[PDB]
Write an enzyme that holds these catalytic residues in place. Sequence first.
Site, short mmCIF file in Angstrom:
data_model
loop_
_atom_site.label_atom_id
_atom_site.label_comp_id
_atom_site.label_asym_id
_atom_site.label_seq_id
_atom_site.Cartn_x
_atom_site.Cartn_y
_atom_site.Cartn_z
N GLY B 20 0.84 -1.18 0.00
CA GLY B 20 0.00 0.00 0.00
C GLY B 20 0.87 1.23 0.00
O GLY B 20 2.10 1.16 0.03
N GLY B 25 5.06 7.72 1.41
CA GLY B 25 5.88 6.69 0.82
C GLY B 25 5.04 5.52 0.37
O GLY B 25 3.82 5.61 0.27
N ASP B 138 -0.38 11.82 13.78
CA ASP B 138 -1.14 11.16 12.72
C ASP B 138 -1.75 9.88 13.28
O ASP B 138 -1.50 8.78 12.79
CB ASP B 138 -0.27 10.87 11.49
CG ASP B 138 -1.11 10.52 10.24
OD1 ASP B 138 -2.34 10.78 10.24
OD2 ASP B 138 -0.54 10.01 9.25
N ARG B 142 -5.99 3.63 10.43
CA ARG B 142 -5.03 3.11 9.44
C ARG B 142 -3.64 2.94 10.03
O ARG B 142 -2.88 2.07 9.59
CB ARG B 142 -4.97 4.06 8.24
CG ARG B 142 -4.77 5.49 8.66
CD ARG B 142 -4.45 6.37 7.48
NE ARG B 142 -3.95 7.66 7.91
CZ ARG B 142 -4.72 8.68 8.27
NH1 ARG B 142 -6.04 8.55 8.23
NH2 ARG B 142 -4.18 9.82 8.66
N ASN B 143 -3.27 3.78 11.00
CA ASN B 143 -1.97 3.72 11.65
C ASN B 143 -2.03 2.98 12.97
O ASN B 143 -1.24 3.26 13.88
CB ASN B 143 -1.40 5.12 11.87
CG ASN B 143 -0.81 5.70 10.63
OD1 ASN B 143 -0.58 4.99 9.66
ND2 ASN B 143 -0.55 7.00 10.65
N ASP B 156 3.74 4.78 12.82
CA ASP B 156 3.87 6.00 12.02
C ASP B 156 3.66 7.27 12.84
O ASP B 156 3.09 8.25 12.36
CB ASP B 156 2.92 5.94 10.81
CG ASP B 156 3.30 4.84 9.84
OD1 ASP B 156 4.39 4.24 10.00
OD2 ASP B 156 2.51 4.57 8.91
C1 LIG Z 1 11.69 15.77 2.73
N1 LIG Z 1 12.14 16.96 3.44
C2 LIG Z 1 13.52 16.68 3.83
C3 LIG Z 1 13.64 15.56 4.91
C4 LIG Z 1 12.69 15.59 6.12
C5 LIG Z 1 12.35 14.20 6.81
C6 LIG Z 1 12.30 14.01 8.22
C7 LIG Z 1 11.99 12.74 8.83
C8 LIG Z 1 11.69 11.54 8.11
C9 LIG Z 1 11.31 10.17 8.87
C10 LIG Z 1 12.14 9.54 9.86
C11 LIG Z 1 11.78 8.34 10.54
C12 LIG Z 1 10.53 7.70 10.27
C13 LIG Z 1 9.68 8.29 9.32
C14 LIG Z 1 10.07 9.50 8.65
C15 LIG Z 1 8.44 7.38 9.26
O1 LIG Z 1 7.42 7.48 8.58
N2 LIG Z 1 8.55 6.25 10.16
C16 LIG Z 1 7.55 5.17 10.39
C17 LIG Z 1 7.82 3.87 9.31
O2 LIG Z 1 8.89 3.78 8.83
N3 LIG Z 1 6.72 2.91 8.99
C18 LIG Z 1 6.85 1.75 8.11
N4 LIG Z 1 5.93 1.02 7.43
C19 LIG Z 1 6.48 -0.10 6.68
C20 LIG Z 1 7.86 -0.25 6.80
S1 LIG Z 1 8.48 0.99 7.84
C21 LIG Z 1 7.52 4.68 11.88
C22 LIG Z 1 7.61 3.33 12.21
C23 LIG Z 1 7.58 2.88 13.55
F1 LIG Z 1 7.66 1.59 13.82
C24 LIG Z 1 7.47 3.80 14.62
C25 LIG Z 1 7.38 5.16 14.32
C26 LIG Z 1 7.41 5.60 12.98
O3 LIG Z 1 7.32 6.95 12.68
C27 LIG Z 1 9.89 6.42 10.84
C28 LIG Z 1 11.72 11.76 6.71
C29 LIG Z 1 12.04 13.02 6.08
C30 LIG Z 1 11.30 16.03 5.67
C31 LIG Z 1 11.22 17.12 4.57
N1 LIG Z 2 4.35 -3.07 9.75
C1 LIG Z 2 3.44 -3.23 8.79
N2 LIG Z 2 3.12 -4.48 8.40
C2 LIG Z 2 2.21 -4.64 7.43
N3 LIG Z 2 1.53 -3.71 6.76
C3 LIG Z 2 1.87 -2.48 7.16
C4 LIG Z 2 2.79 -2.16 8.15
N4 LIG Z 2 2.88 -0.78 8.29
C5 LIG Z 2 2.02 -0.31 7.41
N5 LIG Z 2 1.38 -1.29 6.69
C6 LIG Z 2 0.38 -1.13 5.65
O1 LIG Z 2 0.98 -0.57 4.50
C7 LIG Z 2 0.03 0.28 3.82
C8 LIG Z 2 0.66 1.62 3.58
O2 LIG Z 2 0.94 2.27 4.84
P1 LIG Z 2 1.25 3.82 4.93
O3 LIG Z 2 2.33 4.17 3.98
O4 LIG Z 2 1.56 4.23 6.37
O5 LIG Z 2 -0.09 4.57 4.53
P2 LIG Z 2 -1.23 4.87 5.54
O6 LIG Z 2 -0.94 4.36 6.91
O7 LIG Z 2 -2.52 4.17 5.07
N6 LIG Z 2 -1.45 6.52 5.57
P3 LIG Z 2 -0.27 7.22 6.55
O8 LIG Z 2 0.44 6.14 7.45
O9 LIG Z 2 -0.98 8.22 7.54
O10 LIG Z 2 0.72 7.92 5.68
C9 LIG Z 2 -1.24 0.29 4.67
O11 LIG Z 2 -2.29 -0.51 4.13
C10 LIG Z 2 -0.75 -0.20 6.04
O12 LIG Z 2 -1.66 -0.99 6.79
MG LIG Z 3 0.68 4.09 7.93
#
Ligand SMILES: CN1CCC(c2ccc(-c3ccc4c(c3)C(=O)N([C@@H](C(=O)Nc3nccs3)c3cc(F)ccc3O)C4)cc2)CC1
Ligand SMILES: Nc1ncnc2c1ncn2[C@@H]1O[C@H](COP(=O)(O)OP(=O)(O)NP(=O)(O)O)[C@@H](O)[C@H]1O
Ligand SMILES: [Mg+2]
Lengths: 288, 288
Positions: B20, B25, B138, B142-143, B156
Amino acid sequence: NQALLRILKETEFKKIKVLGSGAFGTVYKGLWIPEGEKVKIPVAIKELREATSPKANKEILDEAYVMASVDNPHVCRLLGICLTSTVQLITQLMPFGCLLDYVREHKDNIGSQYLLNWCVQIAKGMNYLEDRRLVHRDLAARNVLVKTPQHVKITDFGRVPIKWMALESIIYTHQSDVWSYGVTVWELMTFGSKPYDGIPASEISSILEKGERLPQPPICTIDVYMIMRKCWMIDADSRPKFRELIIEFSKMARDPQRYLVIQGDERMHLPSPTDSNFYRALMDEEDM
Amino acid sequence: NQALLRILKETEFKKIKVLGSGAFGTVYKGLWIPEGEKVKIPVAIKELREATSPKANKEILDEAYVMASVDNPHVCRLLGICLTSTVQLITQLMPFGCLLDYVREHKDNIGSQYLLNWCVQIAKGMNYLEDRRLVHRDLAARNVLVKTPQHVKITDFGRVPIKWMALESIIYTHQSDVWSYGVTVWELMTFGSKPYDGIPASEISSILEKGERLPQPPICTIDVYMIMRKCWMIDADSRPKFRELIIEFSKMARDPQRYLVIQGDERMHLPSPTDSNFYRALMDEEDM
Ligand SMILES: CN1CCC(c2ccc(-c3ccc4c(c3)C(=O)N([C@@H](C(=O)Nc3nccs3)c3cc(F)ccc3O)C4)cc2)CC1
Ligand SMILES: Nc1ncnc2c1ncn2[C@@H]1O[C@H](COP(=O)(O)OP(=O)(O)NP(=O)(O)O)[C@@H](O)[C@H]1O
Ligand SMILES: [Mg+2]
Ligand SMILES: CN1CCC(c2ccc(-c3ccc4c(c3)C(=O)N([C@@H](C(=O)Nc3nccs3)c3cc(F)ccc3O)C4)cc2)CC1
Ligand SMILES: Nc1ncnc2c1ncn2[C@@H]1O[C@H](COP(=O)(O)OP(=O)(O)NP(=O)(O)O)[C@@H](O)[C@H]1O
Ligand SMILES: [Mg+2]
């Protein structure tokens, strides 16, 4: 208690790939699909190569509840069961496989710190099993599973492996497990060699009575080979206890290169706390 | 500290399937292949849709170490990172997906005990984040990821979602998170409805100033809808604290059917301690 062994339906799990077989069953990687859920959870499934009866299942369940009752970081817990015509047992899937195959495939990247810690962890698990008064009866490098390279657990306990059995078993006590522990240690220190290679099993008890033991592995100092020989004493009570094995292998693990001579041991290592934390939170959330 | 965020190479993980995308991202299911190892470990990989610079990576790393530092059963920990042209972040793979999609696909098998426990767990995690002085910014259904149906975690955090933000954010405090918590609760109690469905985001702050809130979900009694309305007070300090949300939703969870009217709630349930223990040892070895 009874809540520790889930009874499963056929319709809520599927065997997807074979992983291997022993002289008791076949092990599959499987997917567990919870009722009403849309996900597929990877599991390990052992299906016995021996179809059973309903009264014989009363035997199986009586032991299965015990194996579902172990709580130790270095002992595998039996988790579920499906009592088909041939019984299927379910446990956590270890993608790293068993320790035997692991050492054989990494023998050129395995250092003294990993080897020695593995001996500690296997001993901790045997010491737990002794404290629960459960005799393993089939300890081997094949029945030590790798959760992560830093974390091993003991499997398939509480159920012939002649080359791993004590002379008095060829009687199964915790001291007979100590013997099998020594054989397991020899397997690791030899990077997976086959014990008594080429000698028929019907003739192992003879060579043990005349005094022959497994040879000193090339990377072992005398302090390590002394321990392994002590596990193979004819008098079971003279063998070291698991509680002691922990102490001595922990001692050696704080100065590993003093007790294991491995070519390239300063290159081989242990993962930085950075890599371990990444390992545990992805696969190994247990306390430790 | 620094040991909590593993830096990865491109060559030691692979993205295998998309899962997704959000407006930050794309999320993949990925496989982590440890150096020298023959196994493939499933991970979740978020690759930012925004290529970065090396000095901007100093921003990312500064926050990434914090998110790698959370230790709570109901908060997801950031685990790793690979700082390519577009940064990839790694965390534990949740095969059950997010809670939003989960409730929408199980809305006819979801009882009061599950809904209420989820509200407790999400609150525990928000209360942890407040104790670490981290504002979520946020929070949404969804999160909230499902580790198991019995165990949810918040993701997130610490990074616009107008329909989830407090009126003073359209200022991000823990009390602004309380607002987003109320919106998350409304999403669950409505089995995944879209908040303010059909109303353009540019006009939500107007309707909030005139006093309109989300409607009472059909399965909520007044005691539940009172709490949700309290999270949406214009005065942030008048909103309930997360510490209190835990207490009140735990109270309601010990008598769930008193506080949630769900058709078929005596059929829907909670898993026997038999099924929970099988869940945890396969997927969810955390303490709890
Ligand atoms: C672009 N310009 C220049 C650069 C600046 C910038 C500053 C900080 C970030 C940053 C850093 C770290 C994270 C995030 C973002 C983030 O989105 N992160 C989630 C996460 O990774 N999710 C996942 N889904 C599936 C696999 S990984 C997350 C996961 C978790 F387990 C706990 C907390 C958390 O926030 C981590 C990026 C860019 C912004 C403006
Ligand atoms: N650790 C994880 N394991 C499996 N699926 C995940 C995980 N983290 C996120 N997802 C799924 O990946 C998809 C994309 O997540 P994401 O990029 O965070 O978009 P979002 O949560 O729907 N909107 P947002 O998080 O507020 O930017 C969603 O359907 C999430 O449920
Ligand atoms: Mg998310
Ligand atoms: C045939 N005639 C009639 C019936 C009698 C009989 C008596 C007991 C059993 C029985 C019961 C329970 C188990 C086992 C065997 C066993 O082999 N078990 C392992 C295990 O399942 N391994 C796995 N690999 C991959 C997936 S599951 C195991 C896993 C674990 F996590 C911890 C301990 C353990 O023992 C569990 C079978 C038959 C024997 C003679
Ligand atoms: N939980 C597990 N996860 C992954 N692989 C496993 C697991 N348990 C066992 N295996 C593997 O499955 C294969 C078959 O195991 P098994 O049936 O126990 O035979 P064995 O261990 O080699 N001999 P034995 O256990 O003494 O009967 C081996 O290659 C084991 O490493
Ligand atoms: Mg085995």
